[PDB]
Amino acid sequence: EDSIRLYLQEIGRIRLLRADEEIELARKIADLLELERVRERLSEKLERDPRDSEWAEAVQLPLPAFRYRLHIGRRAKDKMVQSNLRLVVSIAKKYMNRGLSFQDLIQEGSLGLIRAAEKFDHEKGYKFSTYATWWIRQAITRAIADQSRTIRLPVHLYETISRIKKTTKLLSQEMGRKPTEEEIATRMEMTIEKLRFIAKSAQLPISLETPIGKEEDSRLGDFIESDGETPEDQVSKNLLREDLEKVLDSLSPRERDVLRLRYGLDDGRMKTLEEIGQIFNVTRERIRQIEAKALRKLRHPNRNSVLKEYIR
């Protein structure tokens, strides 16, 4: 169940090739490649895709021989991407320890492998070993940086951070332990504010349950609470409600309505005096008057002196 090996065996049992052998290819691959982008051209102009027949190419072809031509053309790439297999693992494995996962890598490469596998030109002669491996690398990096972190950060910043590390190490050389920061900013181009941000920004989270420590007795996170609140607060509040309620609800019961209408005591903050004026009985000159009236009424000692302690 090695998985890595379980695939590694088998790829073994596909065997490596040489430039010449991979040349018959190249042509064929191109022969298929371009052919399709016919298929796309004809797509884009029309019906969105030839994607019928021998007319699934605008080109001319005895139809059976088309699909055939296609087969050999792309079979080359298939019989090439896999044909390589190794070397990409020699590359990906370098990131099997960097992060992601040996298998995870392998794929990624693969992806690349493809792309290269076809964006690739036997006319410049020198082998894909000095080009395929390029695309690979690329692919990869864009994976442990695209994830393997469970909080995706600007893959660009990653470099900046590293670049800082190197540049700061240079400072450290002259100024040991690079105590310089804002002076490092003369070479860091930005206040330590972001430097420190970067520091935290480049933090990897913690299992929430690593067993605590100084004792294997328990995981972590088991000493905190959710976004919820203790009843102690809940209640106090709810007191407020009524406390109020009555205390308001002992002066002009009608007006008390607007007290809750143009304000809260329910679920509007609000009903803009405008709308409210008419809401209760259609009014313009009977609102902010009773409004202040209500407040100043329940205001002043004996009245406001009830929330004086329950200012919640």
């Binding site: 994830q147 995706r152 976004d227 679920d267 509007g268 903050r269």
Partner: protein
């Protein structure tokens, strides 16, 4: 106590699984699915919009706050966000929504499989 009598153990057919996270909205177009494995954003901390913490399919972590914005109060409750399709409903609505992944390949449930009798 008087909410139910017996439980019904069983399995979740792909409809029932996909019936754990539909949260279809009034724009009329379904959701609950998550199109991203990553978590909260790096700059801010908000829950992407289709990752493991997408609000619009689990719920507005910020009580009545369309991830989009515009509304930050119970006042805006039943009403949701046009622009984000966040289902504005406090936050306790989360911890319960569920969502799900259409699978690009079937997987013989570990449980039925390497089980003592390997029922499969």
């Amino acid at each position: 106590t008087n909410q139910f009598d017996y439980v019904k153990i069983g399995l979740a057919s792909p409809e029932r699984i996909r019936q754990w996270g539909e949260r279809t909205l009034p724009n009329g177009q379904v959701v609950g699915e998550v199109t991203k494995p990553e978590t909260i954003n790096y700059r801010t901390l908000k829950p992407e919009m289709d990752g493991l913490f997408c609000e619009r399919i689990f719920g507005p972590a910020k009580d009545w706050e369309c991830h989009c914005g515009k509304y930050k109060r119970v006042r805006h409750r039943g009403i949701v966000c046009e622009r984000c399709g966040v289902e504005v409903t406090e936050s306790r609505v989360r911890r319960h929504r569920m969502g799900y992944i259409k699978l690009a390949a079937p997987v013989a449930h570990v449980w039925y499989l390497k089980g003592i009798p390997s029922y499969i």
